[PDB]
Structure formats: structure tokens, C-alpha cells
Ligand binder design. Structure first.
Ligand SMILES: [Zn+2]
Length: 258
């Protein structure tokens, strides 16, 4: 039926409705750290999030997402491997049922407990709908989560999750500052890829940060209490909403760091 992460509608099925699932530049991938190429022509990332305006938090039945006002250049990503200015639209997470799985990207086959995606779109295309049709339309910042110490800047998000437990619930979520989710270092790997959910469009420049952030077990536990289902349907916990690594095919992963 409609796609998801279950036995009968999960990632191994998606190609029937979205044939680009078997394409040449699909995501995520395993990052082989010994095969990644240091590229000294890569610039530092510029993350300018001081003027970010968050709007809403929403359970969309496959993750939860925080949406931002992208009507002007408030929260932007520039530099790195990018040409031009990319506006922050939303962030969302992927996570597991257990601490040893949950990330989409892996590093030398290592899985992390979760993965944070900050999705940005190239302002030269005027709106995000147009941007997803272009090979350089989106830039997604990927950040790994490991279980350890708590991340204080994540707590405002975990404390509102009980109010968006089921599919289609949303809530006002203003004045959230996404800088509190970033690691110390902005060293990164980058490669051309795709959205990791349908429609799996091959429009993404991936920027995956080397340094994970730490979250506590109590914080990740709250993610795992969300539901895939709508209110009044049989309860199905929202866990393991990650798509496995795809073949690299004819691509090179570049590193910003030696
Ligand atoms: Zn994602």
C-alpha cells in the first residue's frame, strides 16, 4: 500500500512505486574512511542560523519534523562544496529500536543511534518544489547521535513530543534555535546523493559531519515512544525509520579534513 518501514511496505519495496530507488545516486551510503579522498579545494562550511525562525513541529507518520520560515534568507548554509545560498526548511530525525542502529549513513559500517537531517534548498530555484527537480537543488546536513551525556539544546524538542504522538498531529514550536544541535567541529564528508524517503529524488548534496553529538538514553527513549499510526488505529511504535545503505556506484566521497 502506502510506503513505510514495515515488512510489507519497507525500503525493499519502494522501487515498485519509485523506480529511482534503484538509481545511480541513491542515499544513504557507507562512508569508507580509508577510501574517502581529502580535497583541499573544499571550503569550510558557513552555517548562519542566528536569525532562524521555527514555526511548527509535526508528526508526519514517518518521522517528526520542525519547520522554519524560508520566505527570506534567515537561516542559510553556504560554502563547503556548495555554490550559492541554501535556506533551511526543516529538520527531522531517523532512529532505531536499540542503541546500535538508527542512523542512515554509516562510517566504516558503524551505525549510530540516530541521525539528524537539516534540509536546505538552493535559492536560485525560487521554491523547494522546483529545487527537488535539480541535481543541485538541496543540501542536507547530516549529524550522527550517539548515546552518552544529554544534549541540553535538544531537550525543548523532546519535551513536546508527547503532544505529537500520532500521525498528523502538529504543534506551535517557536523560538527554537538549531545551533544547539551542532557539534563542535564542522569537518565533513560530502557526496552527491538523494532524498532517503520517497520520492527519493536525486537532488541532494550531502554534507555529513564527522563529529557526532551525544544525547542521553532518556532523550532517545522519548523518540521511541512516538507512533507511526494515527489516533484510533492499532499502536505501532515509530522506531527503525531508517533506510539501509545503498550502492556507491560511480561516486567519490570527499573529505574536508586529513
Ligand atoms: Zn532524513
Amino acid at each position: 500500500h502506502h510506503w513505510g518501514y514495515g515488512k510489507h511496505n519497507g525500503p525493499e519495496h519502494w522501487h515498485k512505486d519509485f523506480p529511482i530507488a534503484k538509481g545511480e545516486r541513491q542515499s544513504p551510503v557507507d562512508i569508507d574512511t580509508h577510501t574517502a579522498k581529502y580535497d583541499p579545494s573544499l571550503k569550510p562550511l558557513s552555517v548562519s542560523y542566528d536569525q532562524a525562525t521555527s514555526l511548527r513541529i509535526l508528526n508526519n507518520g514517518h518521522s517528526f519534523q520542525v519547520t522554519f520560515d524560508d520566505s527570506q534568507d534567515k537561516a542559510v548554509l553556504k560554502g563547503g562544496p556548495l555554490d550559492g545560498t541554501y535556506r533551511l526548511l526543516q529538520f527531522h530525525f531517523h532512529w532505531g529500536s536499540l542503541d546500535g542502529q538508527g542512523s542512515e549513513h554509516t562510517v566504516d559500517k558503524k551505525k549510530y543511534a540516530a541521525e539528524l537531517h537539516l534540509v536546505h534548498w538552493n535559492t536560485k530555484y525560487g521554491d523547494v518544489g522546483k529545487a527537488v527537480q535539480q541535481p543541485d537543488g538541496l543540501a542536507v546536513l547530516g549529524i550522527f547521535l550517539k548515546v552518552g551525556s544529554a544534549k541540553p539544546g535538544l531537550q525543548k524538542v523532546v519535551d513536546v513530543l508527547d503532544s505529537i504522538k500520532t500521525e498528523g498531529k502538529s504543534a506551535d514550536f517557536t523560538n527554537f534555535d538549531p545551533r544547539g544541535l551542532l557539534p563542535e567541529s564542522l569537518d565533513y564528508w560530502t557526496y552527491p546523493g538523494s532524498l532517503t524517503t520517497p520520492p527519493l529524488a536525486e537532488c541532494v548534496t550531502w554534507i555529513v559531519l564527522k563529529e557526532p553529538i551525544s544525547v542521553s538514553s532518556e532523550q532517545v527513549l522519548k523518540f521511541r515512544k512516538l507512533n507511526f499510526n494515527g489516533e484510533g488505529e492499532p499502536e505501532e511504535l515509530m522506531v527503525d525509520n531508517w533506510r539501509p545503505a545503498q550502492p556507491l556506484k560511480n561516486r567519490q566521497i570527499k573529505a574536508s579534513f586529513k
